[PDB]
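User: what does the whole thing look like in 3D?
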Amino acid sequence: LQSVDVDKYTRARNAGGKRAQDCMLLAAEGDSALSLLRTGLTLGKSNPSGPSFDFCGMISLGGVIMNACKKV
Amino acid sequence: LQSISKKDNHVDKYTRARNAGGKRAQDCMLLAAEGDSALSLLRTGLTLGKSNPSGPSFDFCGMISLGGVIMNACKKV
Amino acid sequence: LIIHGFVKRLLTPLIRVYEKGKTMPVEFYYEQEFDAWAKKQTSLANHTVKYYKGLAAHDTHEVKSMFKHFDNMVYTFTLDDSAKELFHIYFGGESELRKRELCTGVVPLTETQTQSIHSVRRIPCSLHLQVDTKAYKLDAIERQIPNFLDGMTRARRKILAGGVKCFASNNRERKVFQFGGYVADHMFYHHGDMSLNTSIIKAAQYYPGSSHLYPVFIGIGSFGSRHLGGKDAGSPRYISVQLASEFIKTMFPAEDSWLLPYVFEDGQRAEPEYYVPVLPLAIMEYGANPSEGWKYTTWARQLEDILALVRAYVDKDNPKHELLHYAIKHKITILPLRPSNYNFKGHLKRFGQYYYSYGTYVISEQRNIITITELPLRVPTVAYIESIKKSSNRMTFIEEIIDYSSSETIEILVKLKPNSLNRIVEEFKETEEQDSIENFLRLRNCLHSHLNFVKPKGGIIEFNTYYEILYAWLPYRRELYQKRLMREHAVLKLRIIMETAIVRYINESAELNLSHYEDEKEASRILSEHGFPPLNHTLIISPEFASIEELNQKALQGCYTYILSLQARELLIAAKTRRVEKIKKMQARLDKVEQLLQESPFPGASVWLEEIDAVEKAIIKGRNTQWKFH
Amino acid sequence: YSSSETIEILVKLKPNSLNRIVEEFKETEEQDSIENFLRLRNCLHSHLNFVKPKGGIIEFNTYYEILYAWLPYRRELYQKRLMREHAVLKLRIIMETAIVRYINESAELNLSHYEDEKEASRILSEHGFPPLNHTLIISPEFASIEELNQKALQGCYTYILSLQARELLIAAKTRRVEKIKKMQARLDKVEQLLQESPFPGASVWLEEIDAVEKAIIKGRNTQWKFH
Amino acid sequence: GGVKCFASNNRERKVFQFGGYVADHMFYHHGDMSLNTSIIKAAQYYPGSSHLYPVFIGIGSFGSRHLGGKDAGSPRYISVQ
DNA sequence: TATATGTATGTGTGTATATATACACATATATATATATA
DNA sequence: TATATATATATGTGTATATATACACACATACATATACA
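Assistant: Here's the predicted 3D structure for the full assembly of 1087 residues, as structure tokens:
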């Protein structure tokens, strides 16, 4: 019986490095939400005070999370 | 490489007729429908047991899905 | 990591309300906060209300405003010692904790907690669980459990209201996705489109063992069968529905839909809080759902039992009249209330405190073949066959198991291994309650009910017998008859008053010389001097939803528009004869109404017997035509 | 490093490789070496194949052919809308210059005295009122001009018997008189611009050119949101 | 169907509700997914889209230059006008 | 040992054809899994 | 034969997503098949 990677995932440029602790994971619910987040994290010079992909990532929650409080 | 990916070769929609491949195999039809709602219609139709005493049934008739649109072979051979 | 601070969230608006002119909207984060804000208003015909299901409904000029202030709206979670028991209650493997918490409503939020959250931007996990998750679980109970008056859920009540309105003009059929778009547009359905189409499909099915015994719609196409449990219908692209118009006409009377409390969504009304049918339709069908905390399961009753009980309650010269009222006062049972055996050929037995339903086999030793001819209630065929195929203790006696069933009648054929009828009886012992073959071939089941409904004004209610549901249902229909008769009485007096001034204006238009006058001001002045009553023409012709105090409070506060939009077509003598005879019919109807408001045992007791007979003949006609109403 | 609507792409080169790009990806006078390296041109190659009215493929060679095929359809459509407008205006003048004199004469015509609408239609036809098709004069939907002047003078007296008593006042008479004056002026304008050069309806299509152009400008200024 | 639907007031609809309208009143005899995709791509407006003068005003997430307009929302989210 | 030279794949656009899948929620039933008895 | 687990199915009303085929043609990437030789 003993005998790919992440799906819909956009890493940040600074994940697991020298400034790893100051990065966020914006986990969204589906893919239309990730379309909104991709629209909004790419305000280039129209939002100098907002975040971008230098310190933010994206991943989808797949709908409804499985609970672990009753499968353990 | 084939043996690594032979497990994914070994799920089609197929209702076998009772007499497919036997002594009366040439008496049998294969009603190749186009989707799954069509198979719902055909399975409704082939089970009129006494409302259609002169009709067909699954003793000599099968069903299979054509999967939408058939690939052509004339451009791929 | 929840202690040190690792788990965070944004906080976006669910509702924005835009005023004309102002470039800042009013934002709401909860639905009941919007409803409480909106019902306090006086006119909402210069505002626009937007509902945002999902983040992708936000267009560009507001995502820019949401992301100029991104770090301003991220909140961090803290937890205390009062939180571990709440996670075990809300998400643990036992429901009794969840039942006893989930009966009470949501507890609102104090000013100190709200100022602390909106100032320092940290959220207690327990304070999140005792508002947001509890509000979710109460809303899920409301969506997934039926009311006990009409017997239907909230989605199916939206489907019924939008289907009465959709097939109004002519009853032409539409595709399921087109009708779904209609009922999601006009009934303010705020969810996805796939589950609505699934509910429209399953709200129209009719076969032996379906959920609904008396469906709202006639279904035109392929709507699935017994043999897969209705799971093999067509796609909504293919199949169609139309309204079963005479059953909906007789069961849900149209002049009673004006008198019900309605669900207001986004400012304007959507559907009733509940329908009140002529018969107790909550106990007349099948059903089995889970929900949050509770479970819903019903088995339908006989039609003749329910007709006997309602006709014994209402009709005054039935022999079981006062004795049934005694039994309602003391909650004892007299007339029997059996399960329904319609469209089922097997047999039903009561052994203690439960009912059991049995199949039907046909033993043969000439060819060692048992011919199964029926399954128990609500048992699909292919699931039964695969269940009888997986069990290894039963497979040791059979050679081959073959199906020959039609689309509406079971006929399964087993084949036994040679000389194996004898070894079944010592292996599968015969009790008094079931046979050895029925132990062998899985041919009985128990009818075990969970009568957990929702009530008006929300919240769970839980009954112990079907008699309790009937006794809780009857007074609502009683008072609704009293309401419709008093409303009709007021409207008839006011319409007599209206048309017996049209008659005298037609008689005096030549002496009055209306063409001589200048505009509506001088005409209304010269009509006020000759003894014409000022009336409110719109409220008299169409009293849509007006209560009787509203109907006699703004009726005498109008103008002479009733008399001024008269066409010259109707100044003729045949029109005079027509209006005088319809005034005579209206005042005869008024005498009949004020005589109906007095009778025994309560007002409106003969009209309800007539409607029982009408619903009965419509059900009989529908059962004969295979629910096609040809 | 792109924006939502603006491109910004950043490559990095390993050291001492620009000169290898220049000598290895050669430069013609149609495209640069850096554009040959970075895929930075394409051809605007057309296949002008449309369908025609009454079905069937048509294949053009240049965009001038498509423009020159387009123009006469719009020209003839202006001509037939002006013919339709002229016909409807004459018919509505005829319709209201019976209603106004009925308001003037119904005080002593005394239609309240008659039994039903057949006697009323008889006595209305005995004083010179024209029988009209009121539901097609007031709403010509998809009627061509032949079936406009073919079946509209062959109706009844519904235009004159379905008047509300609100209409019999003096201000309503005044408003109908000025509305008759405005329709008469518009009929004069329609017959004046049916005869213009080069083809009928030549200034109207200039005005619609101007309106479409400023609507396109106002839509481009608001990111096609029309604020 | 859009001129017929939005006649009374220019109130927004969803994509699947407007698609149900234009499949009912314009006698469309095909599937719903292709009609909704056609409505979505008829409403889009970005630098490099097919339409330079679109019929509709799109309200929601209608995709960008970067994925070629293939990164819009589902038809239960986005609106047209 | 470089060169051409004729082979074979491979996404991509609009309008069509036919399908697939994860999750929550309650409760009654089930079929095999397991101690320790020995 | 017993007391005891831990995983397993189905119902309605909800939350999220996946995938095969046709049709034309300009364009991109992969050899490979020779033909002088070397």
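In plain terms: Chain A is about 10% helix and 15% strand. Residues 62-67 of chain A lie near DNA strand F (CB under 10 Å from a C1').
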